[PDB]
Ligand SMILES: *[C@@H]1O[C@H](CO[C@@H]2O[C@@H](C)[C@@H](O)[C@@H](O)[C@@H]2O)[C@@H](O[C@@H]2O[C@H](CO)[C@@H](O[C@@H]3O[C@H](CO)[C@@H](O)[C@H](O)[C@@H]3O)[C@H](O)[C@H]2NC(C)=O)[C@H](O)[C@H]1NC(C)=O
Ligand SMILES: C[C@H](N[C@@H](CCc1ccccc1)C(=O)O)C(=O)N1Cc2ccccc2C[C@H]1C(=O)O
Ligand SMILES: *[C@@H]1O[C@H](CO)[C@@H](O[C@@H]2O[C@H](CO)[C@@H](O)[C@H](O)[C@H]2NC(C)=O)[C@H](O)[C@H]1NC(C)=O
Ligand SMILES: *[C@@H]1O[C@H](CO[C@@H]2O[C@@H](C)[C@@H](O)[C@@H](O)[C@@H]2O)[C@@H](O)[C@H](O)[C@H]1NC(C)=O
Ligand SMILES: [Cl-]
Ligand code: NA
């Protein structure tokens with residue numbers, strides 16, 4: 058560790074702790090910068106040499122964390138929790154958590170190499186028949202093919218290609234992860250991840266929210282399944298069974314907006330999927346980012362800096378390069394560089410993704426002057442919800458009209474149902490998946506799910522929550538969890554479930570603040586500078602204050618609450634119920650064992 062990056066001496070008291078944190082800050086920014094830069098060089102240009110550089114950057118970060126972590130303990134262990142400066146308690150709190158820096162060097166190198174290889178396997182996997190990548194090829198097939206066999210080929214090929222090779226590495230990762238966080242005093246890595254919400258009743262709180270949301274999901278499910286039956290027939294759709302996992306428009310069945318064309322109740326109202334118009338009008342990636350930016354400046358939030366437009370990767374490279382395509386927003390921790398890396402396609406759902414990612418950037422811009430340790434969301438759910446909140450306004454027919462993507466506007470009950478259904482396919486359908494992923498991982502971390510039940514426990518949860526089944530037989534050679542990015546990339550998931558609740562709480566608060574008086578799902582906060590100021594206050598706080606308090610100041614409540622989401626969707630909730638009753642549907646999938654047959658001519 059460079060002389061310049063090592064900790065010196067400070068008095069063992071609060072005034073010295075302030076001096077400590079300031080000195081940490083100065084060297085931390087240099088260490089984070091080099092680490093994020095090496096990650097960037099790799100992820101926008103995957104090569105062995107880039108990987109080796111990234112691995113060395115990670116080791117350097119571990120060394121830093123160890124020196125400053127050990128020093129924070131040495132000087133402040135008896136007294137940090139009693140400090141008068143609450144920001145300073147949070148900073149010391151973060152600095153003394155060593156994580157992977159608790160590993161001896163040899164396990165460090167093994168841990169870093171495992172992360173690097175899991176990521177390289179996920180992002181370079183291909184399905185060959187001439188090889189299809191996940192982005193754009195397999196995404197497009199899953200989104201717009203309607204051929205059972207083609208969808209099955211893409212689904213099965215992806216799951217096999219990414220998942221199977223990941224399993225030995227993921228087992229070794231899990232062991233070392235646990236070994237690391239056990240030395241910081243947690244039972245397993247999952248306990249550590251859960252501690253970020255600082256809520257003794259976290260798991261119970263989540264389960265109480267899910268119980269209120271599940272009826273909506275059950276009703277959406279029944280309706281969609283019925284629509285699928287009418288297209289695919291009773292051989293491949295069981296009206297009392299789970300839905301085959303390849304038919305819902307997405308590789309993970311995680312959101313269903315791409316099958317909107319199959320379920321839309323009133324098809325001679327305005328077409329609410331504007332992808333065509335976007336293509337017809339010749340939208341490019343850059344237009345999508347500029348349109349998102351302009352929403353943000355309409356609120357008197359910050360524009361993207363020059364360094365964002367010069368630095369970002371906003372399209373998949375056409376040169377020789379292999380890249381990580383999964384969309385991400387990057388803070389280089391130097392108060393100056395911020396970038397998005399996305400293999401942007403010209404679709405409506407990607408317009409939302411652009412907003413999601415710009416939400417991350419906007420947070421980075423607003424809190425960049427805080428101490429590095431506080432440069433994060435009030436909780437991880439907050440960071441994931443910013444961009445989605447704006448995208449709720451953008452997707453309203455009224456707003457789409459204003460930006461030239463919808464000629465006709467209508468304000469009638471049929472158009473509303475169409476709109477709310479489209480939104481339920483995006484939002485309601487995700488809830489079970491958003492909940493289940495970390496249940497899987499918590500079980501793996503705690504040892505409840507050993508390697509010998511990875512796929513068994515995955516599909517138990519996928520069926521339990523989502524009501525889907527694999528369209529071909531799976532066994533424990535398969536590692537279907539590892540065919541989802543966040544798993545080999547070691548990115549927590551529960552944040553997305555929290556996000557999907559939070560974003561409706563935020564939407565209701567910002568619509569109220571903007572003076573809007575109509576139904577929640579028709580609110581557009583565009584150009585509301587009052588809404589901007591309320592949102593800006595959250596962003597600027599970073600993690601400096603308890604998330605419960607930040608939320609209370611924003612929405613008038615100190616807890617996650619499903620009531621705003623329920624109110625948003627009220628009309629379609631009522632309507633789907635009535636439709637399912639009228640059609641004689643069974644809610645749920647009591648034939649839980651059912652799986653579809655293979656096609657006759659398959660794979661050939
Ligand atoms: C789409 O249409 C709805 C419904 O509009 C109502 O019924 C229609 C058939 C017409 O007769 C309309 O004239 C009628 O308002 C619109 O929602 C309605 O918005 C208004 C305000 O924009 C709401 O009124 C407010 O009520 C509060 C008290 O509760 C007062 O303090 C305010 O001064 C204001 O009068 C009204 O509650 C609301 N009604 C419903 C059904 O919720 C909706 O705004 C419109 N959509 C768009 C995007 O224009
Ligand atoms: C596109 C996005 N990408 C992550 C990237 C997270 C990441 C963290 C650390 C290193 C690399 C990447 C994000 O920015 O958070 C995403 O992964 N989802 C958002 C999203 C948006 C709408 C609906 C659901 C979700 C969940 C999630 C997903 O698509 O699975
Ligand atoms: C992708 O990364 C490689 C390194 O892994 C880059 O190649 C280096 O480029 C510099 C400047 O042209 C050369 O001096 C080095 O000798 C190259 N190293 C190797 C081992 O090839 C490459 O330029 C990167 N590609 C892009 C488009 O950024
Ligand atoms: C796991 O499965 C592999 C591939 O085939 C799968 O199982 C057979 C029986 C078919 O039903 C097929 O549709 C499935 O996808 C096998 O090659 C493998 O040996 C199986 N068992 C083990 C222990 O890996
Ligand atoms: Cl999280
Ligand atoms: Na999609």
Ligand SMILES: [Zn+2]
Pocket residue numbers: 413417440441
């Ligand atoms: Zn995100």
